[PDB]
Amino acid sequence: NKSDAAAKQIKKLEEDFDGRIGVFAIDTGSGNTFGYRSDERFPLCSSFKGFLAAAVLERVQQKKLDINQKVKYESRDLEYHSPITTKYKGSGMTLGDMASAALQYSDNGATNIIMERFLGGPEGMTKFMRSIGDNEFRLDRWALELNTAIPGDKRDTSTPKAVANSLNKLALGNVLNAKVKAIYQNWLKGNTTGDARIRASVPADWVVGDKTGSCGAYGTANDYAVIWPKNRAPLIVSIYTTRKSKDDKHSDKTIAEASRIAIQAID
Numbered sequence: 419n420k421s422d423a424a425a426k427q428i429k430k431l432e433e434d435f436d437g438r439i440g441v442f443a444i445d446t447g448s449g450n451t452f453g454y455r456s457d458e459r460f461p462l463c464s465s466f467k468g469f470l471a472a473a474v475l476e477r478v479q480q481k482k483l484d485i486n487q488k489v490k491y492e493s494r495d496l497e498y499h500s501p502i503t504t505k506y507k508g509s510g511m512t513l514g515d516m517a518s519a520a521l522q523y524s525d526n527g528a529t530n531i532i533m534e535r536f537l538g539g540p541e542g543m544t545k546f547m548r549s550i551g552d553n554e555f556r557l558d559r560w561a562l563e564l565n566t567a568i569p570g571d572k573r574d575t576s577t578p579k580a581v582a583n584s585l586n587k588l589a590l591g592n593v594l595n596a597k598v599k600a601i602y603q604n605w606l607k608g609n610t611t612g613d614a615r616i617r618a619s620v621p622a623d624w625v626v627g628d629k630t631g632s633c634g635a636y637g638t639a640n641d642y643a644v645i646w647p648k649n650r651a652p653l654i655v656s657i658y659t660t661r662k663s664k665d666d667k668h669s670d671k672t673i674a675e676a677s678r679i680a681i682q683a684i685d
């Protein structure tokens with residue numbers, strides 16, 4: 419009945435802002451889960467940057483890449499919303515810095531560069547997700563072109579469930595060895611675009627790592643988080659939403675509220 423009451427509350431929340439909410443949440447302490455629309459498809463927007471960063475660290479682990487190698491891009495015309503890469507245009511960035519910047523500031527320039535030189539583009543990102551047993555994730559287009567969030571379009575979609583499972587394998591599981599996993603968590607923990615989402619839903623002495631996404635279209639926005647509650651097993655929370663009309667803006671408070679709902683469902 420915990421589950422059944424959670425679902426009523428998500429459902430009321432989606433009708434209220436005239437839109438569509440997708441939730442999956444995991445207490446690793448118990449295996450307890452809660453999903454609502456947890457197998458429907460939802461645009462990734464920038465949220466794949468979170469996986470992007472994990473792919474880089476996987477390649478560093480494998481020694482196909484060096485975390486401190488210099489990534490020069492001085493001639494590039496940087497994509498809109500590259501606020502870290504603009505500042506190092508002239509001098510370059512270590513790979514590690516570039517990849518965390520993609521993660522923690524949603525730096526599109528960092529993203530496309532990484533996906534063009536190191537990752538095999540959208541298909542290689544999809545390949546990485548497959549390699550950890552994610553059959554839902556698909557990235558189709560490059561950083562700026564994948565936020566059309568057309569209802570019914572499968573390009574650049576995953577499912578809340580897929581997203582959470584994957585976050586679990588990557589953040590908490592055994593995809594990354596100990597040293598590398600630690601860095602991945604630190605990167606998540608320092609994300610700077612997520613204050614009004616899953617972060618706003620948890621006691622202020624919980625530690626959170628997250629990656630957001632904001633399509634700017636169809637009011638589409640998402641967050642997913644690893645949460646370390648005070649003296650208990652980590653939780654995973656995955657929240658995706660969209661809305662009925664192209665012109666609708668996203669809702670931080672809906673994401674925040676749905677997170678609170680999801681966390682009580684599994685608590």
Ligand SMILES: *C(=O)[C@@H]([C@@H]1N=C(C(=O)O)[C@@H](S[C@@H]2CN[C@H](C(=O)Nc3cccc(C(=O)O)c3)C2)[C@@H]1C)[C@@H](C)O
Pocket residue numbers: 462463464465498499523524526561562565611629630631632633634
């Ligand atoms: C991908 O979805 C997308 C990026 N990534 C974002 C994200 O992770 O949320 C979004 S929006 C996010 C909210 N603040 C930051 C920021 O750095 N700049 C900014 C720009 C306009 C308004 C505000 C504000 O009022 O705080 C903040 C961005 C972002 C659009 C794109 C690049 O595909």
